[PDB]
Amino acid sequence: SLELWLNKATDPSMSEQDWSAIQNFCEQVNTDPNGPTHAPWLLAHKIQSPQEKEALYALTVLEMCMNHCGEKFHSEVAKFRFLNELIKVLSPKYLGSWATGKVKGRVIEILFSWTVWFPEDIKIRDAYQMLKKQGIIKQDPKL
């Protein structure tokens, strides 16, 4: 099941991330019909974790699934509702986020990469720009 793999793939007790589980997760996402509509929220929660390793791992899982899953999953992540969850990590408000700067940087990196690899995704473009406008993302990262 999705949960199963995701938790193996994001386990913070692991000195290293179980790469095989990550692959297993993104495959279930195409497999199970719930996958597209449930996986993003499962991911979103872990990315917002106060446990940094759990967050990073998840960011990596997210990164891998966007690249390997099909149009359905892609479609869900490309929606604003989901992007807004990603963006909460970048909250500039006092105690607005318990995410480390490492995590925030990663989110920022992942977002720009998307604006570049998927120019067809409007909400994604608009969000990155919005962040840019709000001063939350000073300047574009690498790739």
- Cβ proximity of 101 and 95 under 8 Å: no
Tokens representing 128 are 């990155």
In angstroms, rounded to a whole number, what is the distance separating the alpha carbons of residues 25 and 5? 5
Tokens 């386990």 belong to: 11
Domain with residues 1-143, CATH architecture: Alpha Horseshoe (1.25)
Amino acid at 142: K
Resolution of the entry in angstroms: 2.2
Torsion of CA 124, 128, 129, 133, to 10 degrees: 150
Question: Would you say 11 and 18 are in contact if contact means Cβ atoms under 8 Å apart?
Answer: yes
